[PDB]
Nucleic acid binder design. Structure first.
Ligand SMILES: [Zn+2]
Ligand SMILES: [Zn+2]
Ligand SMILES: [Zn+2]
Lengths: 291, 343, 245, 49, 84, 97, 210, 343
RNA sequence: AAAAAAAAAA
């Protein structure tokens, strides 16, 4: 998705809500942003508009060139091959200059990984673990939909270059900006994925309870019974609560859950029942002044 | 039982009335150590940045012409007086004073009719910061070598600072010492509301569960008893600090539960505690929903239908609504026979 | 969509407006004060009249040209054929007997010219539509219909009695009472537009050549104007701040 | 329903409907002849009726 | 702070807010078996008797009008003049 | 309807009853037919005093006052407001003198 | 282009100063109020670069009608940012000419130390200040600004006796108001505002300078 | 609004529009380029070669001392024509915005394209200055790029920075026309030109050469407050409210609007209808706590011992007393001597 | 009997 900001420090933003297919460790939002021109600095006037990247689990702002060097591309021609597909285009070569000028100090992969790891939450010590932590950001958090295995840095660099290419296309006006209320960019969670998410949560709770029971009965040197290990009330009670109440999550943590997902079926006319069975709800709350 | 009644059949131990007659009477809890009142916290630092941290005197002396001009300008407006005094005391970082600090002249005879000068202790006032209810002090310029540059300030230290402020400095500070002394903003004796404020919720026969304020006061009593047991046994300093932290948390979340930066008071049923501020503040609160907008007794409400045969100063009323609604007509000799046949 | 989004901030604006002005009340001295007694207006709406009993009036002396003003408002006694067609012989006998008459009609014309200049100063864009109590055209029509006024027959109303009745009516139509300089000045500042409308409509030309009002019709009109100007005054104790909100 | 005669007199002398005809908001009546009453007023006061 | 009768500066005309409470208080008084100052022609609702003896200005009520400087003027019923 | 409840005389009703200038209808709908109450208040301290109505005794604990006790009619919601503020370490002293 | 524009703005500022002095009740002749641009160019010159006129040449000394020994100086300093040195020079001129009232037409602004000098020097000599951009427009000639009349203590006392008012119950006007700075109102005075009304013709209100 | 010949002629009104509208270097030029020019008299651009030797034939500075880097700015002719600008004004603006640091050379008037050449002179007296460390040491082409962005995105050629688009038009109704009184005494409306500007700066518009200082106003209430005064704020708020209500054709009586306009302007400044203008008044505590921020207002009144004098309507509503308002603004006394013959 | 949520009417 590509959006434009009327107010703020960003001229344009590029957003992806990337998630691994039918898996846990939920959806991570990756941003590739352009810095706005309206920065009152003498030295930044020669710089101009600049491209940064906002990473999951990192509260700081990282330039994209350090990220590209952290994926194993020390040269600049290879990265500009990854972003600018046609070398004959003048204006995109003019737009890629300030990121290259800013990230001139970092020129090696481990230096880029140390740059990444120094800005994460709860930073490590003595560089290399941070570098290891940087790999944990660059393999499990950056774009899980393209791959979380090893040796997937090439495809991830291709997709990151495609995102920067789209951001530069939308900066120069060669493509239209994306629309939030365009319904092609929307999906409908029916009973299937929603009950699948509930079963993920309840199965994780069941595995945790079974693990605690067998860890209690394994430290005494004795064996255990599998039928006594599984507490069968967990899945049944969780599904019954989240279908009867409508609060879509844990019973103790229902404040963070969506309400009104499950509703009492309206039996007044046949048309009322058919309209209730074919209802689509928008997740926007009913207090928005925006039309 | 000394605070009031409990059910519809009992009597008050104090005033010997029923639930309608008894207004309910207050109790008190003597805290072992003083704790901050949370809603006065934004007031309290406003006095803490105007008086000295050591000698408890004002940063600018009250015989200043600017203070006299502020007092002359703000007669009857103590809040604006506090605002102007806080603006005057915002730039003061040293407790400057001393009657012998103006000896710049040579061969000057001392004056027996001289007014007293500023009685400053010559200490640097720390910057006071806060991340919730914890209050810290930092000295950018160092005092004498026995003072650490960064300290945590307990409520007992603030209580001892605000106790030694004279009544004149309170009066220039916009707080009348007859009713509103500053050292009374730190909770040492907690009032206990009567049973009318916290009703015992009865469900089926007997009162099973109380409301949230009774459970919160139970937490208050348990934390206070734990603190006085731990200081009576002479335990370690971290145990005492943890007890003060829990007692301050319980007092503040009895008073205020919606302040950011502070952990929420976790009620049993997955909800936050509804404190006194949540009772008062709001559209459905005690002011807007119960005082400006209380429900009436003699009223009716139904669907309307047109009637062109009625004149504009008439309304058609159904017979059931007319039988339910009554009017208390006085009995006069003019209508005595008609009211007799009515009864 | 437009009906839903708005309704919340409209109600919030109404609540804010009604809470800012909930205790603003016309007091018993005619002044308008809030709960703390702080003075807001010396008279309610700058004229001390309630909003229910006022109407849209046409001020006739603003938009006219100079020659039209002199043609339609300057009373010329020298046209004796018009004086025989308009007035009876008793009125012509009465006006010729008194010596005050010519200078009194000239004083009327001077007051009309000064009122025209003040009205043109107050309204610079030439608005001949004011909001004033006591609709004079409808009351003149009412006293024409009640007393069966014949507009093609000579009348018995001398213009000096018209001047005396208008002056007595404007002296009895007060808003700010008292005899001090401040009280008198506030009285004419409150009743300036009403006095200009009275003099511009109850002129000695319109009530004699156009309306042809009789004597008792004229005192009935004067008494009704005075009574209904009294009735249009704002009641002390009326909550005008909440009404305004 | 008012429950006292002073409140009853206040309803009579202030709150009653014919006293509330004229808005103080815009010095105009708030109540007018509406719907088929107005339509038949227009249809009755024609010349040919 | 009793203002003298010659020094009263308030209006001499009873407005609707005085009229409503005078009629209500007088109706409550007649309903609580006070003597009726005027004759009767068969009226039973005491608010009608209250208007009937308000027409002849025979109601014993002193209205204490409060000026904004916390001074008060006392006006009798017959000193005021009815308008409607 | 199911709990046999009265109608909500809300804020806007109070607004336009202020606009009508009817003080007695406001006092009726907001004090007389909603929640009247009588409290006994110490004259010196202005707080709620002990009142035993059987033997007709009055006593203020905070002032040791037995005689100078007045009686104030007020809405019950105002009494809960004052007692909740007394739990807020606030003294809303109703100076009845 | 600098000389003609500077002469024009100096003529406009001088005209506004003389209209301000006439509105305060000071003795100002009719030809000073009706002074044209060509009359200013003949009287003072037209080349402000070569000191024709100089900024110190345009000093205006004016006197009051009722009391001829109550006078105003109007100074036109050439420095854009005014320090304590020029303020002290003007103050020494005020002692050696025995005049308690002066207005300094600054160009850019003043240092806050000079503002504190004006504050604590005030209850012997009144030393007001004005920006040059504020004096290019006569504020009272705008159609949104009604007639303001300063009242004496006798008229204020008569007002408070007639309307039974205390001084805190009146409406207020700030001392930093452009109209109050135009009329030189100190704290405690009462200004009478006469405005045109669309329901009563005209309306007189009163405000207290605070 | 305009006066004199600007009011009736479109050319002088367009001159006023050019003097008011913000025209930077963005709105006027065609393109920018940075060249390396080793020989200024033998420059790489042949089209410049016809006139650059004209400028260096009698130069004001040594051509050896200048830096070889060149900034070539080609200007659009139609934007120069629309803004009525000329190249000597641009050169003068450059020379007063950058001083003697830059050399500016402009093209001829009747050329095909309008070319500007900007160079930097190497100040050799400033090259030996000490105290230079960790200051992001400067190359000349980067300095030319940064000053190019500086004079491109920030340099004002004419107008006011706070004013955006400016429209020039003739009104068609009798509201924005000038209404005068003729010799016959009638009212004549004259259709003079006027301007509508987005963005307001009244000190920099009223003080212009040919702008009416009387009829010119704004829709910004705060700017009316720092420009004119509080009574002009009252009149301006009444005018904006009238325009807002007259856009939809709704009519409200003048008294209900003038009352609000006098309520806001009563205290001498702008008293907004928010929690920042109502709760900052001198009213009672129960009146202020009934609107917004109930607990904060109540505890501020507790800490300051504020006395509520029971004069508002909501205060007596809370007390349940008859409120001193409406028909409760007086007291009824029983006349003892009027109790004549009854029954 | 309380609290929360959902569906609605004007
Ligand atoms: Zn009891
Ligand atoms: Zn000290
Ligand atoms: Zn007591």
């Amino acid at each position: 998705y590509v959006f434009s900001m009327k107010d703020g420090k960003y001229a344009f933003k590029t957003e992806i809500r990337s998630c691994l297919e039918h898996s846990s460790r939920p959806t991570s939002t990756l941003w590739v942003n352009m810095m706005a021109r309206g920065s009152q600095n003498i030295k930044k006037s020669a710089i101009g508009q600049r491209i940064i990247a906002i990473l999951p689990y990192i509260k700081q702002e990282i330039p994209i060139m350090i990220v590209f060097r952290a994926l194993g591309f020390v040269a600049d021609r290879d990265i500009l091959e990854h972003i600018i597909y046609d070398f004959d285009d003048p204006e995109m070569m003019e737009m890629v200059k300030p990121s290259l000028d800013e990230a001139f100090v970092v020129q090696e992969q481990n230096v880029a990984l140390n740059f990444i790891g120094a800005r994460g939450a709860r930073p490590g010590v003595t560089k290399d673990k941070r570098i290891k932590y940087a790999k944990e950001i660059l393999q499990k958090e950056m774009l899980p939909h393209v791959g979380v295995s090893d040796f997937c840095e090439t495809k991830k660099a291709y997709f990151l270059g495609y995102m920067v290419h789209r951001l530069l296309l939308a900066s120069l006006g060669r493509r239209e900006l994306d629309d939030r209320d365009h319904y092609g960019n929307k999906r409908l969670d029916l009973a299937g994925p929603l009950l699948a998410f509930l079963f993920r949560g309840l199965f994780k709770n069941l595995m945790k309870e079974v693990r605690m029971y067998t860890q209690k009965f394994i430290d005494r040197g004795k064996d255990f019974n599998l039928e006594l290990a599984i507490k069968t009330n967990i899945i049944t009670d969780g599904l019954r609560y989240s279908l009867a109440t409508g609060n879509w999550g844990d019973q103790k943590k229902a404040h963070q859950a969506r309400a009104g997902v499950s509703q009492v079926l309206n039996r007044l006319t046949f048309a009322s029942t058919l309209s209730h069975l074919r209802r689509v709800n928008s997740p926007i709350g009913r207090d928005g002044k925006l039309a | 039982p000394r605070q009031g009644v409990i059910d519809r059949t009992s009597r008050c131990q104090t005033c010997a009335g029923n639930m309608t007659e008894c207004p309910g009477h207050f109790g008190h809890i003597d805290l072992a150590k003083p704790v901050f009142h949370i809603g006065f916290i934004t007031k309290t630092i406003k006095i803490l940045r105007c008086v000295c941290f050591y000698c408890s005197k004002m940063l600018v002396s009250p015989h200043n012409p600017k203070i006299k001009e502020i007092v002359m300008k703000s007669r009857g407006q103590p809040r604006k007086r506090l605002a102007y005094v806080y603006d005057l005391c915002k730039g003061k970082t040293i407790c400057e004073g001393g009657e012998d600090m103006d000896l710049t002249k040579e061969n000057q005879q001392p004056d027996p009719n001289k007014k007293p000068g500023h009685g400053g202790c010559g200490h640097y006032q720390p910057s006071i910061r806060r991340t919730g209810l914890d209050l810290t002090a930092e000295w950018k310029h160092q005092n004498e070598d026995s003072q650490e540059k960064k300290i945590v300030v307990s409520a007992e230290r603030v209580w001892e600072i605000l106790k030694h402020i004279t009544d004149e400095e309170c009066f220039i500070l916009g707080m009348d010492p007859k009713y509103a002394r500053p050292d009374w903003m730190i909770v040492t004796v907690l009032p206990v509301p009567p049973l009318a404020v916290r009703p015992a919720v009865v469900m089926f026969g007997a009162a099973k569960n109380q409301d949230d304020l009774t459970h919160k006061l139970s937490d208050i009593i348990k934390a206070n008893n734990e603190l006085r047991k731990n200081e009576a046994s002479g335990a370690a300093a971290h145990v005492i600090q943890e007890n003060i932290k829990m007692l301050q948390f319980h007092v503040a979340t009895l008073v205020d539960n919606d302040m950011p930066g502070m952990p929420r008071a976790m009620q049993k049923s997955g909800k936050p505690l509804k404190a006194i501020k949540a009772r008062l503040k709001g559209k459905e609160g005690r002011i807007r929903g119960n005082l400006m907008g209380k429900r009436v007794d003699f009223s009716a409400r139904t669907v309307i239908t047109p009637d062109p045969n009625l004149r504009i100063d008439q309304v058609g009323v159904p017979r059931s609504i007319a039988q339910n609604l009554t009017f208390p007509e006085l009995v006069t000799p003019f209508n005595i026979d008609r009211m007799q046949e009515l009864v | 969509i437009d009906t839903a989004v708005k309704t919340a901030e409209t109600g919030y604006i109404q609540r804010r407006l009604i809470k800012a002005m909930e205790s603003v009340m016309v007091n018993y001295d005619g002044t308008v004060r809030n709960s703390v007694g702080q003075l807001i207006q010396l008279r309610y709406g700058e004229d001390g009249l309630c909003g229910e009993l006022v109407e849209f009036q046409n001020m006739p002396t603003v938009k006219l040209s100079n020659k039209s003003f002199e043609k339609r408002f300057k009373f010329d006694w020298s046209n004796e054929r018009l004086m025989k067609k308009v007035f009876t012989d008793d009125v012509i006998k009465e006006m010729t007997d008194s010596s005050e008459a010519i200078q009194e009609l000239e004083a009327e014309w001077d007051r009309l010219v000064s009122d025209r200049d003040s009205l043109r100063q107050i309204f610079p864009n030439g608005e001949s539509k004011v909001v004033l109590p006591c609709n004079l055209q409808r009351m003149i029509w009412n006293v024409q219909k009640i007393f069966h006024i014949n507009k093609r027959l000579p009348t018995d109303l001398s213009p000096i009695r018209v001047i005396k009745g208008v002056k007595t009516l404007l002296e009895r139509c007060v808003i700010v009472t008292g005899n001090d300089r401040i009280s008198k000045q506030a009285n004419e500042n409150a009743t300036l537009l009403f006095q200009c409308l009275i003099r511009s409509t109850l002129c000695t030309k319109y009530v004699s050549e156009e309306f042809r009002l009789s004597t008792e019709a004229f005192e009935w009109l004067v008494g009704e104007i005075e009574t209904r100007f009294q009735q249009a005054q704002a009641n002390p104790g009326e909550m005008v701040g909440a009404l305004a909100a | 329903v008012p429950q006292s005669m002073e409140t009853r007199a206040e309803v009579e002398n202030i709150h009653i409907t014919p006293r509330q005809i004229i808005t103080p908001q815009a010095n105009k009546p708030v109540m007018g002849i509406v719907q088929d009453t107005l339509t038949a007023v227009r249809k009755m006061t024609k010349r040919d009726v | 702070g009793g203002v003298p009768k010659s020094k009263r500066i308030t209006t001499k005309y009873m407005t609707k807010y005085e009229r409503a409470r005078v009629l209500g208080t007088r109706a409550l008084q007649i309903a609580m078996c006070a003597p009726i100052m005027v004759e009767l022609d068969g009226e039973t609702d005491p608010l009608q008797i209250a208007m009937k003896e308000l027409k002849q200005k025979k109601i014993p009520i002193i209205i204490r009008r409060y000026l904004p400087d916390h001074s008060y003027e006392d006006w009798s019923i017959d000193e005021l003049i009815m308008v409607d | 309807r199911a709990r046999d409840g009265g109608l909500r005389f809300g804020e806007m009703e109070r607004d336009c009853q202020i606009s009508h200038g009817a003080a007695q209808f406001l006092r009726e709908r907001l004090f007389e037919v909603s929640d009247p109450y009588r409290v006994h208040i110490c004259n010196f301290c202005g707080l709620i005093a002990i009142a035993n109505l059987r033997n007709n005794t009055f006593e203020c604990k905070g002032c040791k006052n037995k005689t100078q006790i007045s009686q104030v009619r007020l809405p019950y919601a105002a009494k809960l407001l004052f007692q909740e503020l007394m739990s807020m370490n606030i003294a809303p002293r109703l100076m009845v003198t | 282009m600098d000389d003609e524009a500077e002469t024009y703005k100096l003529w406009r500022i001088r005209k506004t100063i003389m209209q301000l002095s006439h509105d305060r009740g000071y003795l100002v002749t009719q030809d000073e109020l009706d002074q044209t641009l060509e009359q200013f160019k003949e009287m003072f010159g037209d080349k402000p670069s070569e000191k024709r006129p100089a900024r110190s040449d345009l000093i205006v000394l004016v006197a009051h009608n009722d009391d001829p020994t109550d006078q105003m100086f109007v100074f036109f300093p050439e420095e854009p940012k005014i320090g304590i040195k020029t303020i002290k020079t003007y103050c020494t001129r005020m002692q050696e000419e025995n005049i308690h009232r002066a207005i300094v037409v600054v160009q850019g602004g003043m240092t806050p130390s000079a503002k504190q000098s004006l504050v604590d020097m005030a209850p012997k000599y009144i030393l007001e200040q004005f920006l040059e951009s504020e004096l290019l427009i006569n504020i009272t000639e705008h159609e949104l600004v009604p007639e303001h009349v300063v009242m004496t203590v006798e008229e204020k006392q008569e007002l408070l006796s007639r309307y039974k008012l205390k001084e805190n119950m009146l409406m207020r006007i700030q001392a930093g108001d452009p109209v109050a700075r135009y009329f030189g109102l100190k704290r405690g005075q009462v200004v009478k505002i006469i405005r045109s009304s669309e329901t009563a013709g005209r309306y007189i209100s009163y405000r207290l300078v605070c | 609004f305009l006066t004199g010949g600007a009011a009736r002629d479109a050319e002088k009104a367009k001159n006023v529009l050019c003097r008011l509208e913000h025209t930077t270097l963005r709105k006027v030029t065609a393109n920018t380029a940075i060249y390396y020019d080793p020989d200024p008299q033998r420059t790489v651009i042949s089209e410049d070669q016809e006139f650059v030797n004209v400028y260096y034939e009698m130069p004001d500075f040594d051509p050896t001392r200048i830096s070889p880097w060149l900034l070539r700015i080609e200007l659009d002719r139609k934007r120069m024509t629309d803004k009525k600008l000329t190249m000597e004004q641009i050169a003068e603006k450059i020379n007063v915005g950058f001083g003697e640091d830059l050399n500016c050379i402009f093209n001829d008037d009747n050329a095909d394209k309008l070319v500007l050449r900007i160079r930097i002179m190497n100040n050799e007296e400033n090259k030996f200055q000490d105290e230079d460390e960790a200051v992001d040491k400067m190359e000349d082409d980067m300095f030319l790029r940064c000053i190019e962005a500086n004079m491109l995105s920030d340099m004002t050629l004419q107008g006011i920075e706070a004013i955006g688009k400016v429209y020039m038009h003739l009104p068609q109704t009798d509201s924005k026309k000038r209404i005068v009184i003729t010799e016959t005494g009638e009212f004549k409306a004259i259709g003079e030109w006027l301007l509508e500007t987005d963005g307001t700066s009244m000190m920099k518009v009223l003080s212009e050469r040919d702008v009416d200082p009387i009829r010119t106003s704004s829709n910004d209430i705060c700017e009316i407050f720092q420009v004119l005064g509080i009574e002009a704020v009252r009149k301006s708020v009444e005018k904006e409210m009238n325009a807002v209500l007259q856009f939809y054709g709704l009519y409200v009586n003048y008294r209900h609007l003038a009352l609000l306009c006098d309520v806001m302007t009563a205290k001498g400044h702008l008293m907004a209808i928010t929690r920042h203008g109502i709760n900052r008044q001198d009213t009672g505590a129960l009146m202020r706590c009934s609107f917004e921020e109930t607990v904060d207002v109540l505890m501020d009144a507790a800490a300051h011992a504020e006395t509520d004098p029971m004069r508002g309507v909501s205060e007596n509503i809370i007390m349940g007393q008859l409120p001193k308002m409406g028909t409760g603004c007086f007291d009824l006394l029983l006349d003892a001597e009027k109790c004549r013959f009854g029954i």
